[PDB]
Write a protein that binds this ligand. Structure first.
Ligand SMILES: *[C@@H]1O[C@H](CO)[C@@H](O)[C@H](O)[C@H]1NC(C)=O
Ligand SMILES: *[C@@H]1O[C@H](CO)[C@@H](O)[C@H](O)[C@H]1NC(C)=O
Ligand SMILES: *[C@@H]1O[C@H](CO)[C@@H](O)[C@H](O)[C@H]1NC(C)=O
Ligand SMILES: *[C@@H]1O[C@H](CO)[C@@H](O)[C@H](O)[C@H]1NC(C)=O
Lengths: 162, 162
């Protein structure tokens, strides 16, 4: 299996992601998105693209990306500080169940995987999530995929932020 | 007029704030919240307080505070990186109108004002906002209140983030 052959699941309407806030990552590829909270935001009233935004929040640092849909269930992210583009797909989504929400998303460079973000608001207890992670591990460079919350900073009275 | 005598307006249900996302600050007191976007977030499913969260996002930096209601329309914020407490009130709110949302919130130390955050998603065009700002300027230390967007960094394809 190669990264280009992973499932490209249908992307739920944006409100279903927003209603899942806040999410935390369970599995990631690089160190960048360890101990990270994901927040989805509807488009600004003054946005001329009317693109929603994904926020990756790690302590007091934040990366933001406006995004739009592209072909074959792609999400085309525009990183807000640089204008750099990223093309993402969803391996699966399972939003707004009786046990909350989960999904796994990935970024390829051809046959190899270069980033992975499995998110949930149920502490990784959706059986689909571990299952999907094990499949993503089988594509080239998937060996880097690892648990995202092994050594996170202590909290100071909040639950999704530190 | 002193800070303790400013109106303490009723705080709208949290969903009305979340539905107003994203907001930007129009007027602030210190430099800290210049060029800042505000995002409200519902409580995490795993939060034991079930407190919602306010996010103050300035470029790639973020401050987060879980908050709960207190007496006399207070909001009691817990800054998520330190556990430091802040007590806030709303001068007014005007959420989810045909011209969008605005509010002005403030933080006193006794008779003086020590922080001010007027937010909107309509670029400060609610007449109540400039009006409220002019009242807040009249309390001790209100002279520091100023326009929040005079010299913000250039954007790179997004609208509420840079
Ligand atoms: C994939 O990797 C190649 C080789 O480093 C690079 O030239 C290309 O820009 C990468 N693809 C994308 C979409 O950035
Ligand atoms: C979340 O899951 C991990 C095990 O994967 C565990 O260490 C942790 O205690 C769990 N948190 C809660 C609140 O149950
Ligand atoms: C208000 O200022 C006084 C004097 O500096 C200080 O002792 C006090 O802690 C401040 N109030 C709050 C609520 O922090
Ligand atoms: C927002 O308001 C300021 C004037 O206070 C103005 O400089 C700016 O052009 C306005 N933005 C838009 C998009 O109209």
């Amino acid at each position: 299996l190669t990264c280009d052959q992973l499932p490209k699941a249908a992307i739920n309407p944006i409100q279903e992601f927003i209603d899942s806030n806040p999410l935390e990552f369970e599995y990631v590829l690089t160190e960048t998105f360890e101990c990270t909270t994901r927040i989805y935001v509807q488009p600004a009233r003054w946005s001329t693209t009317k693109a929603p935004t994904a926020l990756d929040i790690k302590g007091t640092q934040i990366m933001a990306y406006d995004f739009v849909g592209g072909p074959e269930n792609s999400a085309h992210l525009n990183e807000c500080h640089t204008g750099d583009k990223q093309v993402w797909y969803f391996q699966y989504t399972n939003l707004l169940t009786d046990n909350g929400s989960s999904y796994c998303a990935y970024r390829c460079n051809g046959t190899e995987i270069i980033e992975y973000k499995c998110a949930s608001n149920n502490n990784g207890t959706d059986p689909l999530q571990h299952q999907a992670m094990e499949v993503a591990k089988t594509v080239p460079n998937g060996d880097k995929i690892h648990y995202a919350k092994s050594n996170c900073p202590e909290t100071h009275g909040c639950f999704a932020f530190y």
